[PDB]
Design an enzyme around this catalytic site. Structure first.
Site, short mmCIF file in Angstrom:
data_model
loop_
_atom_site.label_atom_id
_atom_site.label_comp_id
_atom_site.label_asym_id
_atom_site.label_seq_id
_atom_site.Cartn_x
_atom_site.Cartn_y
_atom_site.Cartn_z
N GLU A 87 0.66 -1.09 0.03
CA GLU A 87 0.26 -0.05 0.07
C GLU A 87 0.90 1.30 0.17
O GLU A 87 2.03 1.00 0.74
CB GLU A 87 -0.83 0.10 0.97
N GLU A 194 -3.54 -15.01 -4.81
CA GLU A 194 -4.45 -13.77 -4.86
C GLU A 194 -3.91 -12.63 -4.15
O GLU A 194 -3.50 -12.86 -2.51
CB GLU A 194 -5.55 -14.35 -5.01
N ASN A 291 1.34 -9.63 8.72
CA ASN A 291 1.56 -10.47 8.22
C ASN A 291 3.45 -10.89 7.41
O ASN A 291 3.96 -9.80 7.85
CB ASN A 291 0.79 -10.08 6.77
N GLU A 294 4.89 -7.16 6.42
CA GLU A 294 5.21 -6.64 7.46
C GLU A 294 6.11 -6.80 8.54
O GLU A 294 7.02 -6.21 8.91
CB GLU A 294 3.86 -6.38 8.24
N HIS A 341 -0.27 -13.51 10.43
CA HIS A 341 -1.19 -14.43 9.36
C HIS A 341 -0.33 -14.76 7.95
O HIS A 341 0.68 -13.45 7.73
CB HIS A 341 -2.22 -13.99 9.72
N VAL A 428 -9.24 -20.80 0.79
CA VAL A 428 -11.00 -21.21 -0.55
C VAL A 428 -10.50 -20.63 -1.64
O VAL A 428 -9.75 -20.11 -2.21
CB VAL A 428 -11.61 -19.76 0.15
N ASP A 439 -7.35 -8.13 8.21
CA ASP A 439 -8.11 -6.92 9.24
C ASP A 439 -8.45 -8.03 10.02
O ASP A 439 -9.32 -7.96 11.98
CB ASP A 439 -9.23 -5.92 8.68
#
Ligand SMILES: Nc1ncnc2c1ncn2[C@@H]1O[C@H](COP(=O)(O)O)[C@@H](O)[C@H]1O
Ligand SMILES: OC[C@H]1O[C@H](O)[C@H](O)[C@@H](O)[C@@H]1O
EC number: 2.7.1.-
Length: 454
Positions: A87, A194, A291, A294, A341, A428, A439
């Site tokens: 970001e 993804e 993550n 980070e 995560h 998924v 989040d």
């Protein structure tokens, strides 16, 4: 028991305990996310129009911010090539204009505080007080109905009302989300996972603007909360971080005084000086969520070049490298809980012990699966339904590395006094989008773990 059985017990426990949490404070970033599902040919054409050589340059080395279209598309390509999240701040007005014309597919609630508020209050039924920099009509109505509140002032006293009840109509703060699926193609490049790239395009969240209500009337506001989750510091730079940091630290002093556990959601923080300053105040937090990108950026400023590189490799990144990175972070700052995560598994390093840490991770993984499927969660039932999503296969080897190294059993082990908790996640196959899943993961586990102690 098996992982499937552990998952089942975890969700049944959480569905009952989570609703018991009395209140949670959430700040400070809330915005409107304009989500675009990238199209290969459209992006290729735009890359050539912008100047492909420059675009490639930036896809190899992310800039500190975006000032040109080539920088924007190159940053998007950076994320695509690595299948990693990033970001950056869009400082250029011409580029924001370009983004507005480029468009989007859907508008959703955005920001750590905003997204967590909708989940905890709107879905879990947990009362929440959320900080919203600019409460425009569109912003307010993106908040779900339920126990979600913002503070206002009527005669020297705080009055909590639902965002929709706010009488004003401030500015729309837009952040553009560029989503791409696994296998997304751009010329010879292919996305290994993804993910998405975010171009923040507002001038309130980017300076960590904090409302007058959260300043010295903050004590009144948080009188009934049991927990707090703060984020938004990621957008600050060495040029404007001082003032906002003092406000946050004052809030932390009040929170610490009342012994309200506070969790920091780390996010991509391009400015190395600010990233370092965040670490300097992490000891004031009970918990921190992040993550692989980070955690790698943190290792980078701590001099751990090797760990940083491993944390940026293909999924699933090495769990030993992650654990060693978490240990360095804990020793350096004194933060009590680190919830990591990534794609395939989560890890939690804590200075205290308890299976509830692992069970809260399991609850969060189910929430993540539900979120990945529908883009947005509607009820706790949707989370329970996610148990049908199979545990990913690659996590088997990840668990084995951790067992051999630390001796974890049923996802729980110890290292240098800390408890290390691990869980294989439910991935998924065809997710709608990725923005906000992190989040959902961090907030669910933090509130979930706390609820298990009630
Ligand atoms: N298809 C998927 N199914 C389940 N979880 C996913 C999927 N894609 C991403 N995630 C999770 O959501 C997170 C998004 O990370 P972040 O962008 O850091 O908030 C990753 O760390 C994964 O745990
Ligand atoms: O986690 C998702 C959120 O990350 C950051 O807060 C972005 O600024 C925001 O646009 C997005 O909604």
């Amino acid at each position: 028991p098996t992982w499937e059985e552990l998952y089942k017990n975890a969700i049944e426990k959480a569905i009952k305990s989570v609703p018991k949490v009395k209140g949670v404070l959430l700040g400070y970033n809330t915005n409107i996310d304009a989500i675009k599902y990238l199209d290969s040919k459209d992006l290729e054409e735009r890359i050539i129009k912008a100047g492909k050589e420059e675009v490639i340059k930036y896809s190899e080395e992310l800039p500190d911010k975006i000032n040109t279209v080539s920088q924007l598309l190159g940053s998007i390509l950076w994320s695509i090539r690595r299948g990693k999240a990033a970001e950056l701040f869009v400082e250029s007005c011409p580029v924001r204009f370009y983004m507005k014309r480029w468009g989007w597919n859907e508008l959703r609630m955005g920001g750590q505080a905003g997204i967590m508020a909708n989940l905890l209050g709107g879905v879990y039924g947990v009362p929440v007080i959320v900080h919203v920099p600019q409460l425009s009509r569109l912003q307010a109505n993106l908040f779900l109905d339920g126990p979600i509140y913002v503070p206002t002032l009527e005669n020297g006293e705080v009055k909590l009302i639902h965002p929709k009840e706010f009488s004003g109509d401030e500015e729309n703060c837009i952040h553009y989300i560029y989503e791409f699926p696994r296998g997304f193609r751009v010329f010879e490049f292919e996305a290994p996972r993804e993910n998405r790239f975010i171009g923040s395009a507002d001038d309130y969240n980017t300076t960590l603007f904090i409302r007058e209500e959260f300043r010295e009337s903050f004590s009144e506001v948080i009188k009934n909360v049991q927990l707090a989750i703060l984020s938004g510091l990621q957008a600050l730079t060495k040029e404007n971080y001082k003032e906002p940091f003092e406000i946050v630290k004052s809030n932390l002093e009040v929170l610490n005084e009342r012994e309200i556990p506070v969790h920091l959601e780390f996010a991509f923080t391009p400015d190395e000086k600010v990233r370092e300053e965040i670490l300097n105040v992490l000891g004031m937090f009970y918990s921190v969520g992040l993550n692989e990108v980070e955690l790698a950026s943190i290792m980078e400023i701590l001099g751990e070049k090797k760990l940083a590189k491993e944390l940026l490799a293909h999924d699933p990144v090495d769990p030993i490298a992650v654990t060693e990175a978490m240990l360095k972070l804990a020793k350096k700052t004194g933060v009590k809980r680190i919830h990591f995560h990534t794609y395939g598994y989560y890890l939690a390093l804590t200075e205290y012990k308890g299976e509830h840490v692992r069970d809260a991770l399991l609850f969060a993984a189910l929430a993540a699966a539900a979120k990945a499927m529908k883009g947005n969660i509607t009820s706790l039932e949707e989370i329970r339904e996610a148990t049908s999503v199979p545990v990913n296969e690659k996590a088997t080897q990840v668990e084995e590395k951790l067992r051999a190294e630390y001796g974890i059993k049923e996802g729980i082990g110890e290292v240098e006094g800390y408890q290390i908790a691990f869980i294989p996640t439910k991935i998924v196959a065809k997710p709608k989008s990725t923005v906000g899943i992190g989040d959902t993961i961090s907030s669910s586990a933090f509130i979930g773990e706390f609820s298990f102690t009630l």
